[PDB]
Symmetry: C2
Subunit: 931 residues, 2 copies
């Protein structure tokens, strides 16, 4: 078995240099790949392993020199496989890619930082190896901006970072597989400890093999396209994995960094520096599977998960809190609680005596947590309970009061150090996570609210709210929100959809306010859209209404957005209802689908500028919600610069960002990764509030305004004006098969306009072409270079000195690293009509030209010249993804064309749809985020 | 029970059917599931107070000051309309809450339990229409 000598050689050719001297990435993936191929040989034979290894070697050679012969050599093997071998090979390359991902995460997590590699400017903040940690950000604010530590501390107290967990656009990886990946990363990391004994190392090797086999031997296709409740369960796994333990550890490090600049206080335990929100079970935009019952279910499930975690954590807390000296107030509470009926600690104590007063109070808290868990479970599984609401915690203050009593009491007696231990961690967990872990946002199209109001006005013989102008809509809505008479009853003709909308509001009214965040209006365009939701909320008897958040998607909607928000703030009722706070959402992917990516980027910078101007005019604290597709939605270090790049005063101590599902494992799967994620969000938010990016030079604004026009021209001329573009899109890409398959929901929700943004990005990401991300950049840069010889220099100045522009281009460059026009050409050759071949050829030429122009702008000769660690890891993954690409292409030809007969090969040792699904899930997991 | 009666008559057992079974059927028909049907009785003025608080809350005037013809006209527009009349956001005195709560309890119980809603001191058609409207708007 000298086969190992070959994969090592190929791996070393793929990743040649060393990005440091703790660079063990090739070692890691070589070990995992060797062990996997041995498992594969033992289960499916020697021939199967040899076939698979020949394929991988060819793929890696291709990612080296991109010789098209290597692609033809891959295809020759992949077409000759009967569906059984096709399934085994596809599964095999999926798991091989997963192992490359795990090795990459370990390498990232244990890479030593380099203080001497910092250049001293903001470019350092684009990579994890040079970004500023918490304390370096503190000292940068103290030295360069001459801010006093007390100002830094006061900024932190009132700062909030709000991370929003959304469903994965594909395989929301099951909780069990997350755990297996964790065990693999742990075995890997421990195997390279520079002190380990022979027997420990042998047992770790055997544990690693055992786990890799375990992951390879579980099916990941059948049953259902998981119900929204299941997807929510899988999405909540990261709280148990890292986030629950991670929040108090991070906050304590904030305390230590504050001590290292002279601050003696800690960050107050009730200060919400970190918050979590969820769309899982709340986003109904084009998703009929998300019903009123789904929302009720995930709300109660979240209350259960939280009560479970508090219940298990408070037993350790009860063992630690064995003091007897206490406050007079706490002693009074101990005597009161002792007069009652001790069922959840008989294994610990027969009963808690009054000479352990902290244990008395905490034991009663444990009892209330148990009743809350069992009660929410009874509500979920039936619809009623029998658990008195007074025996549980219904709001966060009931929970915090006795814990704070313990903290005050402990501090009274000089036991502050004891109080700053498990008790401080607990208080910070209650403040961060509340009774729900997450707050659920609800999202719905504006048109659905319009349908509801139209049925209402038609039922009252007043006209159709739909035909009314925006001004008449506003006038009627305003008369109703200010009036004293209810609007509608059961005697109302309701369609199925209208009943969905109203029932969602009724379920919101029947659940605790701690469970909900924002009501987000998709396709928001006018103030009447927001006022419709405020009115529907009020008339559905929602006592504590949700905050309404418009999502301005199309480009024209963004241009009209500050006008609409100003008109909203100018209405007296809405002004006094919002209580000085407004949240607006922007969708980078959504706007890019409308007008190309470069135009959407520059338009979103300008739109935030004007919205801040409005908020200052009316004295409102604005919160910008960054949807998916942004620079701030990337994985790792880049986010740090992206946050710093936002326009001045757009954050103001309140950051709300979508954590994309294709990135959540890279960000929260591992202990170190979790800490560093929380750290860069916190540090960048704090720094941006006190140190905005430079204001753009006037010529930069004018130049980008010009480029936006040319870029929208090219993008729309190809996507919307070319008649046969849609025909090509249906051939060169698995868009049709993606919706028809099983993943997500509905993609339409006519033409591309009705197509959702996620399938729009996905379809082209599968083919390694990425047209939605880069299209438009080429013609814009060509146009400005040709108009004036000097514009190139100006572009090169912007990329070097304007953070916004650098992050925009940097994201484009990263997407180009994951692109390969040769593979896209293979899709054309197999799946596209001949008379459409020049069309794709032209698009590929555009791909090439933009690439060179993007390089010229960034001052680079190769892609990602400034981030070799990412270039290295991407090359590693691409070697596995390429095989799944060729396999997916030929599998598509086999599905669509039963007249394409292939010379089959004999089956290799112990359904084309399953193959296709495997390749989609795999390629998606290897490319992760693009646009 | 009627199935038993029909069946017994089918087989020439009508005399058997005309015994304890006939007594039972006649007791079910006479007494129903309640023995009695409960009438509700209330002064007309109390309904007038409820409607007056409502119209005052909507800034339309005082139903009490209105002539009988104006009372009838407004009541008629409301019983024929499609929009509900009031909600929880309504200043209720103790007495007005008694009247409305009585209607709510009536709505939450089986119809076999109730007979007639009797208006004490009834004088005009608006007194009857007030009760019909309050009934309809209390669901
Ligand atoms: Cl469920
Ligand atoms: Cl005992």
């Amino acid at each position: 078995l000298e086969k190992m000598a070959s994969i090592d050689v190929h791996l070393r050719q793929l990743v040649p240099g060393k990005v440091s001297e703790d660079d063990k990435l090739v070692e890691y993936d070589a070990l995992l790949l060797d062990r996997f191929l041995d498992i594969l040989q033992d289960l499916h034979g020697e021939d199967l392993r040899e076939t698979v290894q020949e394929l991988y070697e060819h793929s890696a050679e291709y990612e080296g020199k991109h010789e098209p012969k290597k692609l033809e050599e891959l295809g020759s093997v992949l077409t000759s496989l009967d569906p059984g071998d096709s399934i085994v090979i596809a599964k095999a390359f999926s798991h091989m890619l997963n192992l490359a991902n795990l090795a990459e995460e370990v390498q990232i997590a244990y890479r030593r930082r380099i203080k001497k590699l910092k250049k001293g400017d903001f470019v350092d903040e684009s990579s994890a190896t040079t970004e500023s940690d918490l304390e370096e950000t503190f000292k940068k604010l103290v030295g360069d901006l001459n801010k006093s530590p007390e100002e830094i501390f006061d900024a932190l107290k009132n700062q909030t970072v709000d991370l929003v967990l959304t469903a994965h656009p594909t395989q929301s990886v099951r909780r069990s597989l997350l755990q297996k990946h964790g065990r693999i990363r742990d075995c890997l990391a421990q195997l390279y400890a520079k002190d380990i004994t022979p027997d420990d190392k042998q047992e770790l090797d055997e544990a690693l093999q055992r786990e890799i086999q375990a992951a390879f031997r579980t099916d990941e296709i059948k049953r259902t396209p998981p119900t929204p409740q299941d997807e929510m369960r899988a999405g909540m796994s990261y709280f148990h994995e890292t986030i629950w333990k991670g929040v108090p550890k991070f906050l304590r490090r904030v305390d230590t960094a504050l001590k290292n600049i002279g601050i003696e206080e800690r960050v107050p335990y009730n200060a919400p520096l970190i918050q979590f929100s969820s769309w899982m079970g709340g986003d109904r935009d084009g998703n009929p599977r998300v019903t009123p019952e789904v929302t009720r279910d995930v709300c109660l499930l979240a209350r259960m998960m939280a009560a479970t975690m508090y219940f298990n954590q408070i037993e350790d807390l009860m063992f630690e809190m064995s003091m007897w000296r206490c406050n007079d107030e706490l002693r009074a509470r101990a005597d009161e609680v002792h007069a009652n009926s001790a069922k959840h600690y008989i294994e610990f104590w027969k009963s808690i005596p009054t000479t352990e007063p902290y244990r008395v109070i905490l034991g009663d808290v444990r009892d209330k947590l148990y009743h809350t868990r069992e009660r929410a479970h009874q509500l979920l599984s039936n619809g009623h309970s029998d658990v008195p609401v007074e025996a549980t915690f219904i709001n966060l203050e009931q929970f915090l009061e006795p814990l704070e009593l313990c903290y005050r009491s402990l501090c009274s007696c000089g036991d502050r150090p004891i109080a700053d231990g498990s008790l401080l961690d607990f208080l910070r967990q209650v403040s961060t996570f509340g009774l729900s872990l997450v707050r659920l946002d609800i999202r719905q199209e504006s048109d659905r609210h319009t349908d509801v109001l139209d049925a209402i006005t038609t039922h009252l013989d007043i006209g159709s709210y739909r035909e009314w102008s925006e001004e008449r809509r506003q006038e009627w809505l305003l008369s109703e929100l200010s009036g004293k008479r209810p609007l509608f009853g059961s005697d109302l003709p309701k369609t199925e959809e209208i009943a969905d909308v109203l029932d969602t509001f009724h379920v919101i009214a029947e659940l605790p306010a701690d469970s909900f965040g924002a009501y987000i209006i998709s396709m928001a365009t006018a103030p009447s859209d927001v006022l419709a939701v405020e009115l529907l909320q009020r008339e559905c008897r929602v006592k504590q209404p949700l905050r309404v958040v418009p999502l301005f998607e199309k480009l024209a909607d963004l241009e009209a957005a500050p006008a609409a928000v100003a008109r909203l703030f100018s209405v007296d009722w809405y002004k006094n209802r919002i209580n000085g706070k407004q949240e607006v959402m922007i969708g980078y992917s959504d706007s890019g689908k409308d007008a190309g990516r470069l135009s959407a980027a520059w338009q979103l910078y300008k739109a935030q500028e004007e919205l801040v101007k409005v908020a200052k005019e009316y004295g409102v604290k604005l919160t910008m919600f960054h949807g998916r597709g942004g620079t701030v939605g990337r994985g790792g270090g880049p986010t740090h610069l992206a946050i710093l790049s936002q326009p001045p005063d757009t954050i103001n101590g309140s950051l709300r960002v979508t954590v994309q599902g294709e990135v959540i494992e890279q960000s929260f799967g591992e202990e170190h990764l979790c800490f560093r994620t929380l750290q860069r969000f916190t540090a960048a938010t704090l720094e941006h509030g006190m140190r905005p990016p430079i204001s753009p030079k006037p010529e930069w604004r004018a130049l980008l305004d010009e480029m936006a026009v040319v870029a929208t021209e090219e993008y729309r001329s190809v996507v919307f004006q070319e008649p046969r573009f849609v025909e090509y899109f249906r051939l060169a890409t698995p868009e049709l098969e993606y919706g028809r398959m099983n993943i997500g929901s509905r993609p339409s929700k006519g033409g591309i306009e009705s197509l959702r943004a996620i399938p729009w990005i996905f379809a082209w990401t599968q083919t390694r072409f990425h047209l939605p991300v880069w299209l438009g950049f080429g013609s814009a840069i060509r146009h400005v270079i040709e108009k004036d010889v000097r514009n190139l220099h100006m572009l090169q100045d912007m990329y070097q000195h304007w953070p916004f522009f650098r992050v925009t281009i940097d994201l484009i460059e990263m997407v180009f690293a994951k692109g390969d026009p040769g593979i896209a050409a293979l899709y054309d050759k197999l799946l596209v009509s001949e008379e459409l071949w020049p069309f794709g050829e032209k698009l590929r030429a555009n791909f090439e030209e933009t690439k060179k122009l993007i390089l010229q702008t960034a001052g680079h000769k190769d892609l990602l010249e400034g981030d070799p660690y990412l270039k290295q890891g991407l090359r590693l993954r691409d070697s596995y993804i390429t095989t799944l690409n060729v396999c997916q292409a030929y599998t598509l030809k086999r599905i669509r064309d039963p007249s394409y007969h292939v010379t089959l090969r004999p089956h290799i040792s112990k359904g084309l749809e399953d193959t296709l699904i495997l390749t989609m899930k795999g390629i998606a997991a290897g490319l992760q985020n693009t646009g």
